[PDB]
Design a protein around this nucleic acid. Structure first.
Ligand SMILES: NC[C@@H]1O[C@H](O[C@H]2[C@@H](O)[C@H](O[C@@H]3[C@@H](O)[C@H](N)C[C@H](N)[C@H]3O[C@H]3O[C@H](CO)[C@@H](O)[C@H](O)[C@H]3N)O[C@@H]2CO)[C@H](N)[C@@H](O)[C@@H]1O
Lengths: 256, 82, 106, 129
RNA sequence: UGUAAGUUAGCAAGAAAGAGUAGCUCUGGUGAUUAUCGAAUCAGAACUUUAAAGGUUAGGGG
RNA sequence: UUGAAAAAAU
RNA sequence: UAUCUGGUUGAUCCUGCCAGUAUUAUAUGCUGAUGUUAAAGAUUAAGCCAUGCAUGUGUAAGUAUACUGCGGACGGCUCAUUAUAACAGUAAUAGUUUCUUUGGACAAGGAUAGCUUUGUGAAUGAUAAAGAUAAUACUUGAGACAAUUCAUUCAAGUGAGUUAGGAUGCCACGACAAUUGUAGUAACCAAUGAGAAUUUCUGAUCUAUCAAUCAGUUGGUAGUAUCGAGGACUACCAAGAUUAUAACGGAUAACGAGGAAUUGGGGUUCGACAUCGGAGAGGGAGCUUUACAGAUGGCUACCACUUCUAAGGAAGGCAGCAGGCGCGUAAAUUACCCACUUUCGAAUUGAAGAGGUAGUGACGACACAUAUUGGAGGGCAAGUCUGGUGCCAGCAGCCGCGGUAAUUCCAGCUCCAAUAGUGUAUAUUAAAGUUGCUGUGAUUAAAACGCUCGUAGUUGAAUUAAUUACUUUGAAUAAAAUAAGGUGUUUAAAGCAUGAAUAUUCAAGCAUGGGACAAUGC
RNA sequence: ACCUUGUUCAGAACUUAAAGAGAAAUCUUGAGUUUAUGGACUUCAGGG
RNA sequence: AAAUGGAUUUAAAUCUCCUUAUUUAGAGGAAGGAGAAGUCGUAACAAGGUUUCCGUAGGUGAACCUGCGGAAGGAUCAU
């Protein structure tokens, strides 16, 4: 290769994009934006696979270009805009809204959002950096740069953001008495309560989280996304609540 | 590899080509079912071996094996309604 | 050389002891591409030069009709067995004749 | 041009490397610009990723420093006295980092060692022992 | 610096082949007596020119 | 004491 | 389907191999009713090419009584190179980093296009000069810091930082288009960036008729160079680095990985080619534009080729899609369209031999009308049928059948296996316990050094009430694929029309419960 | 000391075997403890 | 800021010495193998009519003969 890669082959796409293998040679490449390449779902697939509004991808351009879909506090006109984490998603022309969420079955699920709870969106602190001029600020999960935040914030907490005002509402610390929902690999799609965190000075920090029903699972620190403090749920969890069913009610249940 | 579309075979020719202990028994099934040729006899033989091995691999473990319960229940369930 | 940590002697022994077979060794020497008139080819095209008849071995009797064929890729000379009864007449001088091995491997 | 790759060297055991591909542009290299004495003459070379390097061939004025009194006033340099990298660099009067130079203390009173990269920064800076 | 075939293993061999050599100003190494004193010899560095064994003596090679 | 040989295949 | 059979002899028991056997992938003879799916110039030549197409782009938002901006650094093709090189898993960038995208003077100075004005050549995407003419082309201008360089200081989250930041002295670029509709710009910080590029550990075929190899070579100092670390280069210093645990060298008909053929367990063979990474555009070499090219459907020089010509000159790189010659045993149409998937653009529209459809197509795969191939002595199913030939023609993969009464030849009649299939030649695997760790033999079949000493290597008696290996768990771990969970494409091959937790990771690496067996010496 | 006899260690061998092995001859101070296949190490052989 | 002179860098292409692979060399020379009835001998298998074979040395148309030492796979497990 001489430079950047543009064409994404169908199979090289992440497996959680619901794509087929005989549909076509290429897959829509998500552009640069607020979330990663494999941590996203392109806006073209959302309106053609999950929503089934368009027969093919040509008609997606006849939708986004009309200034129809609103994401976060602004409104975009990019066909393949990168849609990743639980950032809100509003389509006023159809009077319906959704939310891109993980599920325990390793996919991207869309939980409907009402107009009352689409006014704010959660964000995750990635790092606290003392900028120039003695001006500290924190980089969020969506890559959002924000001005002077609460000085009590750390680099691994969570901030309750508002879209229109763009100000911090509430903060939940990363401690032992809180709850989190996973964004990782096997553990992603699982909610639970942090019970113990072991620190390894060598490479990684490992944390133990217990599910609501008592199930205990292990994951890395980089996978932790705190959803609340004290088993309280600050957003609408998916239909399955994010519990990890022990496959007893999947093979047998699907029979009937 | 050349094509993305998968493919498979169904019948495998018996190793010994000429036996009088296997020629007579082939017409006891061809004439009885009114079969056209000997392709079908090899095809069901593949089918029986398709699950005979599956039953044998998971029969060697304990009755408490999670994989034995998971695939075994599906294996018996699939083979009961058929 | 049964020891648990002696996995180099056993591997080296097999590498040494594998060269003594008459069959696989033919598959690693560069002689198929060099000395075999066919090479790795299934068939060889050639040109007819001489008509010859080889008498059979001691228990049998008779003359086997054959032709000396010169190839177009190597130029070597190989004796070819005319297939059927009275089929030596069909072949002519200076014509394309296909040559492809025999029953015994190579 | 001058390639800084490691495909033309040998291994740690003395074996000679065997080539697979031609030169790659990501192994750029430019001829050294020995900053000699003379009139102000600084060129601009276009590096990779579009950045611009102030390429200097000859300068006579350098912004000096002296920390015991915290005064930094530029002055003209007379000539290079001693170099720790090469001896033939003294006679050519080239300007390189860590080279002892002699100056006129005209604005320092009313032996300097260079501590910049004049071939890259485009300017000459130093301090006083 | 390098040097083949052959060989009686000694030789072939100065094999073949390639680089250097001036002038001036310097530096270092090689000793005796307890700092002085004495020898031509080797090595290295700047600078200059008309780029240096060739006035005489002075192997052509395979 | 001397004493060699017995055409190819059925 | 954890399988054998014929062949040394009058006969028997063995070693032993030949042939038989079944399957995958190449070619070919004969035959070839359909429907669905599908390989297809690689092997020998990364050989040479006539021709045609394959990269262009205009919204109300740059300039309008072509300039400017972006892209052609993606896509696509081939496998020549390449043996710790590349690649795969993994770890670092507290040693570097863009492009695109997402978060932070009521108006200046100019001439260069379009169109001409007069043309020059046989042409080359050929080129001359005279007149103006606009900028989101170029300078300015001002409406007000930021960020780099150097010498010095206050010094915290961090596994770890005289570090992010702050304060000095000081140099340098120096801004927020003089910006368009009746959005556009300069920089600076961060994310996209698990990205790109370097780099840590582990892992590769055969060969000793390759045993010693290296002199920028091994490291240090200081500079230079590069976006960035470093002998990457330079000047000085010391002689150091690898090596029987296979260094250095040699061959490949060697691009690597995911994987494929075949397997009772163990294994063997293949992988250019779906997808990822690498390299190349006849051969190296040198550069331009740009954010990324050592770009070749960009340029230049040389070596070897090709095309037109007015004999003065001009360009070209089909290892892109079709197609032509040669090469061969060996491989399709010089078709149509951007409708599906996707990419580019001045951005809802314009472009794509990417992509889709059609065409040839017994490489192959699935369901299926009612017709051939080979044989009829044994392995192996089938004739104790009739004419000729008389060790001659001949058949025979092997054992053999034929010297005038052929169970085998050339023929006439019949049935044996398979069926859109079937013989043939080569190669892979199983049989082969004929490569042997699981799994061989060494008195006589082939095979114990003439014997002893001995370094590397392997293997090393019992006993105890800090690492590494071993063992159990997790984490993360590309898809495709392997076996499938579910799902009546009418079944099936298919396909994913809820996406099985889908299990996969051999070799390495990270954290962890145990120390019986183990290696390291106080 | 020599000659007869008992116990025991080392050494060159021998007789029998209805047992073990082998294809058999034969071997038993192994050529036994081997399809019920693994005590440790070195060398050699792959039809003529 | 165009021609052009000069000095560096990377250096294509070419001439001379220096290894791996493929070939031409005539009949040439010396080997080996295969093909029913072709010559000369009796060497081997019985005590093969001189027991055979191994190492070494010499000789000779040919097998082979002879000298020194060894072996029984000898024709003696034995006085
Ligand atoms: N095979 C090479 C050697 O041949 C040697 O001998 C070879 C010849 O001297 C021997 O020849 C024999 C002969 O001995 C015997 N007394 C007469 C017989 N006719 C010959 O026969 C030979 O020649 C005739 C000539 O037409 C051919 O037909 C026949 O096929 C061939 N074997 O036959 C052998 C092959 O030609 C030795 N046997 C031996 O050193 C070795 O085997």
């Amino acid at each position: 290769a001489r430079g950047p890669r543009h064409h994404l082959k169908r199979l090289n796409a992440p497996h959680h994009w619901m794509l087929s293998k005989l549909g076509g040679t290429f897959a829509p490449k998500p552009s640069h934006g607020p979330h990663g390449m494999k941590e996203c779902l392109p806006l073209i697939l959302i309106l053609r696979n999950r929503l089934n509004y368009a027969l093919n991808g040509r008609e997606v351009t006849m939708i986004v270009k009309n200034r129809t879909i609103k994401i976060d506090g602004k409104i975009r006109t990019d066909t393949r805009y990168p849609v990743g984490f639980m950032d809100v998603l509003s389509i006023p022309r159809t009077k319906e809204n959704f939310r891109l969420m993980y599920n325990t079955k390793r996919r991207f699920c869309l939980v409907p959002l009402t107009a009352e709870q689409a006014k704010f969106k959660l964000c995750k602190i990635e790092k606290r950096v003392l900028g120039t001029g003695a001006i500290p600020y924190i980089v969020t999960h969506d890559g959002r740069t924000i001005r002077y935040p609460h000085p009590e914030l750390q680099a691994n907490d969570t901030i309750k953001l508002n879209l229109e005002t763009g100000k911090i509402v509430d903060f939940v610390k990363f401690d032992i008495g809180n709850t989190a929902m996973m964004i990782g690999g096997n553990g992603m799609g699982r909610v639970g309560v942090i019970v113990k965190r072991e620190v390894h000075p060598g490479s990684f920090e490992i944390v133990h989280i217990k599910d609501a029903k008592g199930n205990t699972f292990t994951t890395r620190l980089n996978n932790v996304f705190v959803i609340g403090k004290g088993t309280e749920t600050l957003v609408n969890l998916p239909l399955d609540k994010g519990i990890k069913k022990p496959l007893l009610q999947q093979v047998n249940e699907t029979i009937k | 590899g050349r094509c993305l579309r998968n493919h498979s075979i169904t019948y495998k020719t018996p190793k010994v080509p000429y036996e009088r202990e296997r020629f007579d028994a082939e017409l006891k099934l061809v004439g009885q079912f009114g079969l056209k040729n000997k392709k079908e006899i090899q095809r069901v033989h593949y089918m029986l071996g398709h699950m005979r091995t599956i039953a044998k691999v998971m029969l060697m473990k304990d009755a408490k094996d999670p994989k034995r319960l998971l695939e075994g229940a599906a294996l018996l369930r699939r083979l009961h309604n058929l | 050389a049964r020891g648990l940590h002696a996995a180099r002697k056993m591997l080296a022994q097999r590498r040494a002891n594998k060269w003594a077979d008459k069959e696989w060794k033919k598959g690693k020497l560069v002689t198929r591409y060099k000395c075999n008139p066919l090479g790795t080819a299934s068939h060889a095209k050639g040109l007819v030069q001489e008509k010859l008849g080889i008498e059979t071995k001691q228990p049998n009797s008779g003359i086997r009709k054959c032709v000396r064929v010169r190839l177009l890729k190597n130029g070597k000379k190989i004796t070819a067995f005319v297939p059927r009864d009275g089929s030596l007449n069909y072949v002519n001088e200076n014509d394309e004749v296909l040559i492809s091995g025999f029953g015994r491997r190579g | 041009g001058i390639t800084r790759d490691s495909r033309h060297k040998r291994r740690a055991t003395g074996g000679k490397k065997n080539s697979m591909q031609k030169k790659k542009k990501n192994t750029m290299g430019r001829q050294p610009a020995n900053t000699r004495l003379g009139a102000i003459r600084v060129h601009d070379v276009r590096c990779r990723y579009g950045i611009i390097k102030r390429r200097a061939l000859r300068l006579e004025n350098g912004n000096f420093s002296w920390a015991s009194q915290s005064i930094t006033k530029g002055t003209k340099i007379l000539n290079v006295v001693y170099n720790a990298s090469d001896n033939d660099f003294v006679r050519t009067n080239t300007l390189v980092k860590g080279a002892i130079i002699e100056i006129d203390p005209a604005p320092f009173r009313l032996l300097a060692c260079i501590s910049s990269r004049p071939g890259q920064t485009g300017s000459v800076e130093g301090y006083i022992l």
